[PDB]
Symmetry: C3
Subunit: 597 residues, 3 copies
């Protein structure tokens, strides 16, 4: 009788236990203490209750789903995926997750402690899939929420190396769904061709979702893969920290981004990226504005390390028929970024910041402002013509650069005869240090190439830290660019031998509220009078100049040109020098030309 | 016989076990392996040893205390609070913690792994309480220490929604006490009206205490609550990182602060705050100086995201009869902060930095210096008159601003006819970017309103980035403010149409070691002489000016005014221009006035 | 029969269990569920299988090694070191780790969850040791890898207080070896005299190794200890975050460093250091370049708090017969550092950044560039003569300072008649704020002491924020230092009473591509002519000056000196002033001297 009970599945419920033989402890049964934990092994059995060993020819999916469903029924808990085993998944899930090509359905309060390895079987080759899905409905708009679901451990999700079957397919590791207080910590995602590794939230619905101390390795492998973003953050008060992202595929240099920050109060910090095209998008899509409003604000990209091939941070916002997206209150700081070794134009245009047109190419829908870029480093190798501190390709309502170090081909750039952005409140502080890696490479090129429709309320304070006489100019405005209510200065250091410093092809520096200064060489002639004597410019190009001063020594004994000049209505400069002995003087002098500064 | 033993509480101590049938493993009994872990279930029993189910009508407090006391007796360990259950607490603790309105007494080396939910029963409604207390005595001065106590897990402490009964009451979640190597990680504290969620240390006694990845949600709910600070850090080598703080109550906008950093080598990093009045205090209270000395130094507030209604960082120090507190070596960097949408003056004055008078209102007791504020963003909506980069309300011995972006009503402010602080070593670097949100709102107002007793060894380098002709002046010193050994500059950009740029109501810019420059409009008249000819100012207000130069074009052909001016003893400016044709000239010119720069 | 089986070591394999009595769960045996975890207790037994109690007189080493070896055999897992016990280690390991004075050999996929205490027995007194070793061979070049090995928990590794027996000995806590995806989290290392606490990687071989939330306390205690670096990072894509490091020994002030970052893509963040000589080395040793190439790049030191006695960050690179090491793409940001209270010259020279010669003292082997130092604070007490923002002691190919706050004796320093470094691309932006703690201490001293062989492509923009008339000069170049293609400026603020501002002992400011400006006092005499009249310098020292302007008021009525000057071939300055009444004038005026700026 008793032997039978003991050898039965209830035997453990008949063996008494009391913790450490403490007389004041609960008199329990072994089964009670065992019931305090739960593993996959508890559900990984055949219809007769016999345990089944996982392996390449066993599909563990129904067993893991049964575990999650059961623990869900009790109010939650943590299911362990045991170490020292690989658990293969080999069929699709059913019900609500079928619309998402779901394998496993996550449930609220049911955490997974993944210590072993989860692998995809070749059933998934050339097919879409999303491994873990928190939606409970095919239609995300009619889905319930996922709350308090955490995935963590020292384990591994391995996507089996399979290529995409078709570019239109989607593949994901974890889709938390309409996700509140959910996280992934510690896990290695590897060996795939996927669209995302993790997505958080759904069109603004969700909160407090995080990815921390995870690794993402080799998650693009084919030319079929349309696009890849390793973590898409689509709910507020969420972010990514202390993660490692690496790709080795060539295709990843053209298509892969590490992070999308698409809702307010989101962050990307303390991570290391290598082998990717892009670092992060910081974006408000109107099409995603349902759950948390139409503004992306409080967006933070900080203290990351990257080697990328395209753009580090891309800013944007866009509209739909009924919603307009807005982006503001952004900080990009402390990141050290480089474009990896590559040929010029062999990948998307290299940039630290990109102001990106929308997915249909429009550049007149964006509302981006109050962005602070500060205390970052950027480097691109000397050969990479297509490298810029900022590629400013769509309308910009403000962006502030302070105390960065940029060492690349262009500081500000936009391609001519593409978009003509409207620019407001572009602020480039004199504390931005311009590196010299690209010195001597800039023939035909303008360091600050202002290829815009208009610039207003902007500040460009150019300071070189070494010579580059190859460059056509430090800063150039084409005649088509309006310029008003702006400050544009070129410091003289390392400019003495430059023919052109600042160029205003439409003579826009004449505007009533344009404040500029830059070096120029000017020819002057004096009157013949002995004593105090006026010197006048030969050219009549200076009706806009409020004052000028000498940047050249005077090699003469018998006279000196004026130290300082003002102008005359006919556009000459004029100053008062000194003839110790009389005679008409003729000199060529390097001047600092100033207007309202 | 054997059946009896097996069904007894010692039955598990009679069932042999050897790990994985390994012949070299220990021959143990099931009870030994079970004894490797411990849960609340092991103590949650009646006097007969029968397990009791937790619930709203069961008080789990004595059972949890018995578990902690027992594990403490064995040298420590980790007690799990099981998932899928809510454990209610419904009575006060006894002994040493009674003086602290304690519920549970923490003990050294006994960690709590909280995976379920701990809730307060309505016994606590309208009463004080501190849920977990690490002091062992009613009098903190006679308390022993708490060491090596960690609280962690995916669980929840829920304060039951109860309001305070009286403003003088105190309520806390975790009071570690005189706490060494203690931490809270992962836990959600929610649904209360409390004074603090967590306190670390006691008046400088403690070390290596941290709060990490915790959430604090809705912990103020009534007008009775006197004050709320979510984490009070009162021991050195301690801090808060990667936490989330949110309030929805109106009252929280007026009374709630996220963090107090009150001892040296403490930090607040990588967190997100919404709905609070204040971000952090960085303070040395003399009354708290017993355990770690009288200096708060090495204080770090970094990489946080906040939407607040009052002040982001408040600095201070104060004194007692016998102790003087000092604050120095502070860094505030990388934070992106905004004042949330509100009416002007509807909450405490909005500020990025506040120099706060002591709790009795004194402004002449503080010793604050060597503070660095760098690479932060601040924004306040255009309507919020009461918004400042720094509200400088008490004596300041130094604070350095570099490469911040401030977009609010005032840069520097103090209210006139309140405190008259004594200011030393206020440094505002030209790399601080002043935003334009408040342009056109500043009628009657000074952007830098220097409402102080005295300013010395200070630097204010004003740089606008857009026009605001509504403002009375960029910077103004009342006659009551002494000014010496200081540098005060206003860059000309966007100032051409300003009637007043810098204003010294006591003509303080004349001081021997004052170094200033700013734009002014000046009327000048020349002598009638043809040729080189002097121009003189009509007004005699310029005896302090060392040089001036033209910021205006010359619309004339027949003459030019001087490019550069110096002065004369009677206070006129004078320069040498050029009359091509003779005649008395009269012109109004915008000049850069300079003094010793 | 059945009684015998049940009391046997297989008894638990005969007691059936099914999780929570769920009919769809696996019918298992108690032994199966127990086998899901493993502890030291499972191996801590005598030859008869009887458990042995750990203690000061028991050597736990063979038992722990047996556990690791066994778990390794099953594909890995996590062995717990139980809480509430101290486990002593009292003999050396055997085999592959014997060459490393190894105690325990780590194995791939076998994690240690250390919750108790591991202590060293006095067998190790005066001997070398490395507690945990991941190499499997005496010769690291012939060692296999360690992968997926994590050490974590709330436990403690205690080195027993024993002193080193001889300086040439080595002692370590954890040597992961050729280590891929390995980490230490949560652990306290204490009470030793050791060389390192943790090393990661081996000469570039390894990846994704981290130390997080660990504490290192009192790990130097004797004068025998040659050198100490708490964490040596010798593999890429690895780092240290949120750690606490403290020393109390005097010897630690002279010999101890917290971190070595010696391979690319490595970081040191969010940590607190006290009592150490140095913060971090960022170094490419040619001798260590085998596994990850010859370049250290993407090196990040950020958001740390330190009180040190020598240098905070030391940069270097060096060569071997066949390999040349290079260092580039470094960021040092957000750190708040101070030199602790000490006598001048009582420890290694105090510095925020050191450019360190190699271990044989060579200063002409280094290739260091593209370094960004930004948004840091540094303080040293007024008495510490040996304190510098940068001690630039070996060849430097570039380093950029922006928006730091440095408050110490020197800004730039190198000792004369030591090394004569070759300097390129030293950039000190005007946004670096120079503190006043050392005002009045600088007799005989130059704030920027340019004791170099040559300086090129460099920028020094000096800005004072208070007076220090004790200093000999703001910046001084000895005649032996060449200077070309550089910008050197001293802002006038707080300089009016300085006899020397910038000093060029070799008249190097005359160079064709040197761009300089600084204040000087000049004596001038005019001609006697009434009206517009020239003033000329008495001295002929100004042939290099392109323009000068007045920094002094004019106390005269009857005349004014020129506002602005240029020069003449004989080296005089000349300008045009105004005599209202005739007469030879003689004045002494403070001028801003400018050259090509
Ligand atoms: C790979 C990636 O992330 N790319 C970024 C762009 O994302 C956009 O394209 C993606 C391509 O894969 C996604 O669209 C695709 O997936 C959609 C969502 O799938 C459906 O809904 C899921 C919830 C279900 O599980 C699925 O079964 C499926 O039903 C699908 O509707 C599209 O048809 C398909 O092409 C991506 O869509 C978002 O995905 C997230 C995460 O899964 C999800 O939370 C969202 O709900 C979903 N959004 C929308 C609108 O559906 C889609 O956004 C991204 O647009 C771009 C940003 O840069 C551009 O835009 C900037 C702003 O104008 C501009 O500054 C910049 O210059 C532009 O380049 O960045 C990546 O390219
Ligand atoms: C809510 C909050 O934190 N407010 C900050 C101010 O704190 C000060 O007021 C608090 C109001 O709750 C606390 O005082 C209250 O509690 C005291 C401590 O309780 C006793 O001791 C405990 C150890 C026991 O468990 C309790 O049972 C009880 O016996 C009590 O003595 C007071 O009477 C009561 O009002 C707070 O007190 C500190 O609390 C911490 C954490 O519990 C504890 O470690 C300390 O020991 C205790 N300190 C003292 C001195 O007792 C008390 O400090 C805080 O002052 C303010 C800082 O800003 C102001 O001061 C700046 C410096 O001059 C100035 O720059 C600024 O402008 C000022 O506004 O910030 C919050 O307001
Ligand atoms: C304490 C410390 O870390 N000091 C830093 C300097 O490190 C150099 O000296 C150390 C002194 O302990 C180490 O050398 C010692 O150990 C060597 C390694 O031990 C062998 O190999 C191990 C793998 C085995 O387990 C051991 O059993 C043993 O066989 C040994 O070869 C030496 O003979 C001995 O003195 C340190 O050596 C490195 O150690 C790490 C971690 O263990 C290991 O991964 C490496 O493989 C090993 N490297 C080498 C080359 O062997 C050795 O590097 C460090 O040099 C210094 C940097 O600053 C100087 O150099 C800069 C660049 O030129 C210059 O800018 C600066 O001014 C200089 O001061 O910083 C610390 O001093
Ligand atoms: Na779908
Ligand atoms: Na901005
Ligand atoms: Na246009
Ligand atoms: Na009390
Ligand atoms: Na400071
Ligand atoms: Na006064
Ligand atoms: Na060795
Ligand atoms: Na640099
Ligand atoms: Na030389």
């Amino acid at each position: 009788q008793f032997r039978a009970i003991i050898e039965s599945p209830e035997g453990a419920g008949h063996v008494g236990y009391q913790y450490r033989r403490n007389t004041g402890s609960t008199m329990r049964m072994v089964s009670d203490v065992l019931d305090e934990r739960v593993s996959l092994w508890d559900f990984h059995c055949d219809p007769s209750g016999n345990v089944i060993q996982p392996g390449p020819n066993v599909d563990s999916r129904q067993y893991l789903q049964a575990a999650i469903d059961y623990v869900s029924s009790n109010g939650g808990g943590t299911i362990t995926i045991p170490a020292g085993y690989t658990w293969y998944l080999g069929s699709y899930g059913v019900g609500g997750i079928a619309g998402h090509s779901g394998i496993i359905q996550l449930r609220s309060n049911v955490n997974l402690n993944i210590e072993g390895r989860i692998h995809l079987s070749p059933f998934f080759d050339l097919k879409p899939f999303q491994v873990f899905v928190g939606f409970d409905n095919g239609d995300p708009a009619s889905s319930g929420n996922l709350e308090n679901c955490h995935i963590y451990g020292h384990g591994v999700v391995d996507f089996g190396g399979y290529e995409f079957g078709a570019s239109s397919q989607l593949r994901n590791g974890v889709a938390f769904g309409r996700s509140y207080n959910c996280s992934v910590t510690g896990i290695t995602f590897q060996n795939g061709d996927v669209t995302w590794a993790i997505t958080l939230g759904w069109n603004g619905y969700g909160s407090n979702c995080y990815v921390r101390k995870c690794r993402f390795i080799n998650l693009v492998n084919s030319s079929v893969n349309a696009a890849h973003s390793t973590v898409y953050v689509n709910c507020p008060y969420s972010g990514v920290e202390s993660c490692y992202f690496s790709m080795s595929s060539s295709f990843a240099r053209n298509i892969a981004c590490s992070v999308q920050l698409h809702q307010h109060d989101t962050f990307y910090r303390g991570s290391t990226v290598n082998g990717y095209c892009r670092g992060a998008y910081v974006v408000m899509h109107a099409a995603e504005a349902a759950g948390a409003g139409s503004y992306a604000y409080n967006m933070q990209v900080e203290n990351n390390i990257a080697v990328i091939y395209g753009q580090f941070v891309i800013l944007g916002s866009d509209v739909t028929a009924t919603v307009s997206g807005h982006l503001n209150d952004v900080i990009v700081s402390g990141n050290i970024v480089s474009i990896g070794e590559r040929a010029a134009f062999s990948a998307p245009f290299g940039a630290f910041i990109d102001i990106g047109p929308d997915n249909s190419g429009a550049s007149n829908v964006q509302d981006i402002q109050r962005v602070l870029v500060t205390g970052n480093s950027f480097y691109a190798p000397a050969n990479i013509t297509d490298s810029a501190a900022i590629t400013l390709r769509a309308n910009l309502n403000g962006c502030t650069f302070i105390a960065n170090n940029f060492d690349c081909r262009y500081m500000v750039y936009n391609a001519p005869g593409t978009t003509s952005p409207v620019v407001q409140n572009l602020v480039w502080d004199k504390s931005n240090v311009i590196g010299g890696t690209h010195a001597n490479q800039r023939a035909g090129q303008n360091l600050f190439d202002m290829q815009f429709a208009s610039v207003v309320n902007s500040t460009i304070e150019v300071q070189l830290s070494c010579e580059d006489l190859s460059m056509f100019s430090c800063i150039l405005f084409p005649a088509s660019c309006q310029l008003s209510y702006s400050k544009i200065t070129v410091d003289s250091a390392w400019t003495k031998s430059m023919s052109n410093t600042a160029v205003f092809e439409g003579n826009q520096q004449a505007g009533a509220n344009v404040y500029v200064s830059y070096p120029a060489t000017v020819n002057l002639t004096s009157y013949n009078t002995q004593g105090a004597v006026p010197f006048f410019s030969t050219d009549t190009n200076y009706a806009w100049v409020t004052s000028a001063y000498s940047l050249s020594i005077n090699e003469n004994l018998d006279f000196s040109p004026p130290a300082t000049y003002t102008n005359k209505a006919n556009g000459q400069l004029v100053g008062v020098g000194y003839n110790e002995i009389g005679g008409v003087r003729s000199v060529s002098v390097r001047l600092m030309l100033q207007r309202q500064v």
